[PDB]
Write an enzyme that holds these catalytic residues in place. Structure first.
Site, mmCIF file in Angstrom:
data_model
loop_
_atom_site.group_PDB
_atom_site.id
_atom_site.type_symbol
_atom_site.label_atom_id
_atom_site.label_comp_id
_atom_site.label_asym_id
_atom_site.label_seq_id
_atom_site.Cartn_x
_atom_site.Cartn_y
_atom_site.Cartn_z
ATOM 1 N N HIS A 108 66.055 -30.231 -27.531
ATOM 2 C CA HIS A 108 65.220 -29.037 -27.470
ATOM 3 C C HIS A 108 63.958 -29.199 -28.305
ATOM 4 O O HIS A 108 63.005 -28.434 -28.164
ATOM 5 C CB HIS A 108 66.004 -27.808 -27.939
ATOM 6 C CG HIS A 108 66.433 -27.878 -29.372
ATOM 7 N ND1 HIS A 108 67.632 -28.429 -29.766
ATOM 8 C CD2 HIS A 108 65.820 -27.463 -30.507
ATOM 9 C CE1 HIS A 108 67.741 -28.352 -31.081
ATOM 10 N NE2 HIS A 108 66.653 -27.769 -31.554
ATOM 11 N N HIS B 273 63.275 -33.531 -34.935
ATOM 12 C CA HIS B 273 63.394 -33.239 -36.349
ATOM 13 C C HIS B 273 62.910 -34.399 -37.166
ATOM 14 O O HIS B 273 63.297 -35.555 -36.893
ATOM 15 C CB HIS B 273 64.867 -33.005 -36.671
ATOM 16 C CG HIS B 273 65.314 -31.671 -36.117
ATOM 17 N ND1 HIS B 273 66.573 -31.253 -35.891
ATOM 18 C CD2 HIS B 273 64.462 -30.644 -35.749
ATOM 19 C CE1 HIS B 273 66.516 -30.013 -35.389
ATOM 20 N NE2 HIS B 273 65.225 -29.627 -35.304
ATOM 21 N N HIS C 48 59.637 -29.514 -38.580
ATOM 22 C CA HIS C 48 59.573 -29.639 -37.128
ATOM 23 C C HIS C 48 58.550 -28.672 -36.549
ATOM 24 O O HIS C 48 57.904 -27.924 -37.282
ATOM 25 C CB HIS C 48 60.946 -29.383 -36.505
ATOM 26 C CG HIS C 48 61.497 -28.025 -36.800
ATOM 27 N ND1 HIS C 48 62.513 -27.814 -37.706
ATOM 28 C CD2 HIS C 48 61.167 -26.804 -36.313
ATOM 29 C CE1 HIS C 48 62.790 -26.523 -37.764
ATOM 30 N NE2 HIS C 48 61.985 -25.889 -36.928
ATOM 31 N N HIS D 23 57.284 -25.931 -33.114
ATOM 32 C CA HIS D 23 57.606 -25.106 -31.959
ATOM 33 C C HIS D 23 56.350 -24.969 -31.116
ATOM 34 O O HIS D 23 55.255 -24.807 -31.654
ATOM 35 C CB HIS D 23 58.092 -23.724 -32.395
ATOM 36 C CG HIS D 23 59.423 -23.738 -33.075
ATOM 37 N ND1 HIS D 23 60.601 -23.478 -32.409
ATOM 38 C CD2 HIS D 23 59.764 -23.982 -34.362
ATOM 39 C CE1 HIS D 23 61.612 -23.559 -33.256
ATOM 40 N NE2 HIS D 23 61.130 -23.865 -34.448
ATOM 41 N N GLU E 288 55.592 -19.009 -32.600
ATOM 42 C CA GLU E 288 56.740 -18.117 -32.677
ATOM 43 C C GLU E 288 56.383 -16.832 -33.416
ATOM 44 O O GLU E 288 56.624 -15.731 -32.921
ATOM 45 C CB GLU E 288 57.921 -18.820 -33.347
ATOM 46 C CG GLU E 288 58.617 -19.828 -32.452
ATOM 47 C CD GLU E 288 59.946 -20.282 -33.011
ATOM 48 O OE1 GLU E 288 60.040 -20.477 -34.241
ATOM 49 O OE2 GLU E 288 60.899 -20.447 -32.221
ATOM 50 N N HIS F 72 57.163 -25.735 -38.964
ATOM 51 C CA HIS F 72 58.153 -25.229 -39.907
ATOM 52 C C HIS F 72 58.592 -26.311 -40.882
ATOM 53 O O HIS F 72 59.088 -27.360 -40.476
ATOM 54 C CB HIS F 72 59.372 -24.661 -39.180
ATOM 55 C CG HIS F 72 59.096 -23.395 -38.431
ATOM 56 N ND1 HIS F 72 59.742 -23.069 -37.260
ATOM 57 C CD2 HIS F 72 58.235 -22.382 -38.683
ATOM 58 C CE1 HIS F 72 59.297 -21.902 -36.826
ATOM 59 N NE2 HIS F 72 58.383 -21.466 -37.669
ATOM 60 N N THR G 21 65.019 -19.501 -36.053
ATOM 61 C CA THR G 21 64.440 -19.065 -34.787
ATOM 62 C C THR G 21 65.245 -19.565 -33.589
ATOM 63 O O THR G 21 64.926 -19.255 -32.440
ATOM 64 C CB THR G 21 62.975 -19.513 -34.658
ATOM 65 O OG1 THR G 21 62.907 -20.944 -34.658
ATOM 66 C CG2 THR G 21 62.154 -18.972 -35.819
ATOM 67 N N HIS G 22 66.291 -20.336 -33.868
ATOM 68 C CA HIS G 22 67.189 -20.830 -32.831
ATOM 69 C C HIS G 22 68.603 -20.949 -33.390
ATOM 70 O O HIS G 22 68.780 -21.050 -34.606
ATOM 71 C CB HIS G 22 66.709 -22.184 -32.302
ATOM 72 C CG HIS G 22 66.753 -23.283 -33.319
ATOM 73 N ND1 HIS G 22 67.891 -24.021 -33.567
ATOM 74 C CD2 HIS G 22 65.801 -23.771 -34.146
ATOM 75 C CE1 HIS G 22 67.638 -24.913 -34.507
ATOM 76 N NE2 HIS G 22 66.377 -24.785 -34.876
#
Ligand code: FLB
Ligand code: ZN
Length: 256
Positions: free
Chosen positions: A60, A63, A90, A92, A102, A115, A195-196
């Protein structure tokens, strides 16, 4: 879980009920309603490049992990009395340049979001332990804006060729993540979550007021990564951003 319609953020509440929690991230930061806090101290980051360990394709996203054995790379100041140990950073992004971030400010979407994650090494001895603790995680959120190419991103983007497919791993050494941070470290802070999935509400957010640049071509390199394993049909990671969440009476403090 994932980001497709069949297993996306809308379906997360099925296996992760906390998704419908009261301290979920991301959120929309409305500057008019942010409260300046006098107790807030300046954010202090001191990272050791030798701490950088490896980069991993996790289907997804990807990292960039660091050695969290000691306090060589820590986060101080802000709302924290404790010291937080860096372990990973990482990104988004979205399927288009316009709305890939986000967190939003005054309803404004950005292209992507960086992040930088830390865990409370003052109270706990492992990320696994701190991950579920309200005061366990501290994450710096940097909003990324489409524009000129960001030279600081290049070492990371150059490494994505070694982790093309899901599961791929590669050494990622000698790198200071603070070089990705904005010139100023003015920030908003609020009690949030991941966030996930697992979506643990254990994150104290440090959202930078200042954004950093990223070219459309660099964003294209993010979507260039494959969510499938090697040998299978190529399925690019077009997006991995979560919609903003109900603030639920939470207060977003400002350091400025
Ligand atoms: C994909 C690399 O794995 C290294 C550790 O993975 C985690 C990252 C995060 C982060 F905060 F970055 F989102 C959280 C967690 C945990 F919460 F512990 F599950 C693991
Ligand atoms: Zn994240």
């Amino acid at each position: 879980w994932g980001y497709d319609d069949k297993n996306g953020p809308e379906q997360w509440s099925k296996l992760y009920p906390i998704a419908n929690g009261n301290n979920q991230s991301p959120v929309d930061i409305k500057t008019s309603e942010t409260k300046h806090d006098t107790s807030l101290k300046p954010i202090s980051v001191s990272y050791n490049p030798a701490t950088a360990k490896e980069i991993i394709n996790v289907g997804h996203s990807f990292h960039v992990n660091f050695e969290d054995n000691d306090n060589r790379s820590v986060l101080k100041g802000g709302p924290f009395s404790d010291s937080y140990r860096l372990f990973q950073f990482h990104f988004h992004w979205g399927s288009t340049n316009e709305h890939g971030s986000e967190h939003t400010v005054d309803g404004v979407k950005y292209s992507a979001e960086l992040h930088v994650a830390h865990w409370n090494s003052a109270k706990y001895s492992s990320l696994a332990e701190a991950a579920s603790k309200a005061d366990g995680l501290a994450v710096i959120g940097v909003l990324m804006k489409v524009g000129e190419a960001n030279p600081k991103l290049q070492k990371v983007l150059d490494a994505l060729q070694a982790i093309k497919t899901k599961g791929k791993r590669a050494p990622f050494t000698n790198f200071d993540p603070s070089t990705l941070l904005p010139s100023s470290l003015d920030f908003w802070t609020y009690p949030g979550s991941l966030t996930h999935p697992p979506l643990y509400e254990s994150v104290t957010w440090i959202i930078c007021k200042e954004s950093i640049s990223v070219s459309s071509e660099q964003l294209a390199q993010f979507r260039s990564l494959l969510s499938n394993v090697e040998g299978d049909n190529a399925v690019p990671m077009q997006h991995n951003n979560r919609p903003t969440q109900p603030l639920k009476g939470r207060t977003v403090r400002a350091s400025f």
